[PDB]
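Anyone up for a design puzzle?
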């Protein structure tokens, strides 16, 4: 049986379509969502989920969380370096990637790719499903943010493979939410706006939904804007406050910083229903206590620039779809951070008083949609009708003379899609031709994201400009790029190498074996 897993920054959730409906499956603690946490105890035990989160404050250096904020990123990504300040576990550079180093008991050190941490979370979600179903689960639909780039998508797929899952399809989070909203609606064509603000990433998608036919018209997001940033802002406010009042800098004491995290999380939840919240930490720093009152007004003030920045993607989506505010028939809110009253207010005010759709749990709707998609792709006939057209989030381009972004496949193109182009050589007997592919909307490549450098190899000796190599760039239904090449001369095998440093089957096998040790 194929399950849907929402692999989230802060929490994950697993559902299954069985007997004509979705079941969101409760974990072994009775909880319908599971924290995306992995911890290693002094005695060498690996904890995952609720048990891992519960011991954050006593064992912070060896409690791992927020791996989705690192997955598929390079070491020098400013999102990675900015987040290190608030993470208690050591982040170290390996293979141009941020790896996670922990102590596994007995003074023994171990380093993990973010993929491996996410694989452990996926394994726990798989196990939750296997307990409920009473049998092995080998196939899953796994979620990603709509605005995830090529590397982030592939890395999430690799996490699934490490966890023993054949990833049937990766599904964009707002699209899954739209399926939860729209399945079995028979209203004809409606324009649906999904506003998806979770623990770590933000997406906006505009879909048309028409009697089982779902199409993403436009999407735009920010893969490093979410609940964890709102917590960070408040954490940093109190770290600086303590330094001003006492002279003491607590930024390197991991117990102090993560005890503050724990209190900020509780406070943020309370402030969605109350107007004040108490922060209280007994052994904060060097024996001394820490007590502060956080008002809703102050919480909103500290984050207002981030909150107001959520309207930037909304306007980008309206522009690309050529729709006005009044053309939006339904607003679907998903992700835990859409519970924040000020977020709800800003969205309502942007759309001139329009209330969001009712009957949608923002913590569960994504998993619900993923579970439906899994059922449909399996060959179920008791599921509602589902035809899905989804898009690539980023314009793909090639770097040309002067550092210019020459567009190849535009943003918001329905996938799968491909584009071909003929390449030749610049010098006599040149054996290799290098192509640099970028992701983004700016005119110069220095202001976009490098996807990869691809080398056409084994070009046979000939005078400059004679070889004719057709290179095909295909984005698959998961949103992942494949680059291939064919010789179109009058008469060789052209192999392509790249600098993506992708996890090989050998490397994945080693990671599977390492995880069996616990």
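Challenge accepted. My sequence:
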């Amino acid at each position: 049986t194929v399950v849907g897993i929402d692999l989230g920054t802060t929490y994950s959730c697993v559902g299954v379509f069985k007997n004509g409906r979705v079941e969101i499956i409760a974990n072994d603690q009775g909880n319908r969502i599971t924290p995306s946490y992995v911890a290693f105890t002094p005695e060498g035990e690996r904890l995952i989920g609720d048990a891992a989160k519960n011991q954050l404050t006593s064992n912070p250096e060896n409690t791992v969380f927020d791996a989705k904020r690192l997955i598929g990123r390079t070491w020098n990504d400013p999102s990675v370096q900015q987040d290190i300040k608030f993470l208690p576990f050591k982040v170290v550079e390996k293979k141009t990637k941020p790896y996670i180093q922990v102590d596994i008991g007995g003074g023994q050190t171990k380093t993990f790719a973010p993929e491996e941490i996410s694989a452990m979370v996926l394994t726990k979600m798989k196990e939750t499903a296997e307990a409920y179903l009473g049998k092995k689960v080998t196939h899953a639909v796994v979620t990603v943010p709509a605005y995830f780039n090529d590397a982030q998508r592939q890395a999430t797929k690799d996490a699934g493979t490490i966890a023993g899952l054949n990833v049937m399809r990766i599904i964009n989070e707002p699209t899954a939410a739209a399926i939860a909203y729209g399945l079995d609606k028979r209203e004809g064509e409606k324009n649906i706006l999904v506003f998806d603000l979770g623990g770590g990433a933000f997406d906006v998608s505009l879909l048309t939904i028409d009697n089982g036919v779902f199409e993403v018209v436009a999407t735009n997001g920010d893969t490093h804007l979410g609940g964890e940033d709102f917590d960070q802002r408040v954490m940093e406010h109190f770290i600086k406050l303590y330094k001003k009042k006492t002279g003491k800098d607590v930024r390197k004491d991991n117990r102090a910083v993560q005890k503050l995290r724990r209190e900020v999380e509780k406070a943020k939840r309370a402030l969605s229903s109350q107007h004040q919240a108490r922060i209280e930490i007994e052994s904060f720093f060097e024996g001394e206590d820490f007590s502060e009152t956080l008002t809703r007004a102050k919480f909103e003030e500290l984050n207002m620039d981030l909150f107001r920045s959520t309207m930037k993607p909304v306007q980008k989506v309206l522009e690309d779809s050529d729709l006005k505010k009044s053309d939006i028939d339904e607003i679907v809110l998903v992700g835990g951070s859409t519970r924040i009253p000020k977020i709800q207010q800003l969205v309502k005010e942007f759309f001139n008083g329009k209330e969001p759709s009712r009957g949608i749990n923002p913590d569960e709707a994504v998993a619900y949609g993923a579970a439906v998609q899994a059922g449909v792709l399996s060959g179920d006939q008791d599921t509602g009708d589902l035809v899905l057209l989804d898009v690539c989030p980023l314009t793909l381009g090639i770097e040309t003379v002067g550092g210019v972004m020459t567009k190849l496949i535009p943003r918001n193109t329905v996938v799968p899609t491909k584009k071909s182009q003929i390449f030749s050589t610049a010098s006599d007997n040149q054996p290799t031709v290098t192509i640099k592919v970028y992701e983004g909307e700016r005119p110069l490549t220095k202001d976009n994201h490098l996807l990869g450098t691809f080398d056409l190899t084994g070009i046979p000796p000939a005078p400059r400009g004679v070889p004719q190599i057709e290179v095909t760039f295909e984005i698959d239904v998961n949103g992942i790029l494949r680059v291939t090449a064919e010789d179109k001369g009058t008469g060789n095998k052209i192999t392509i190498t790249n600098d993506q440093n992708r996890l090989t089957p050998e490397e994945i096998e080693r990671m599977v074996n390492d995880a069996e040790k616990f």
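A detail worth pointing out: The chain has four domains: 1-185+361-389, 186-225+310-360, 226-309, 390-503.
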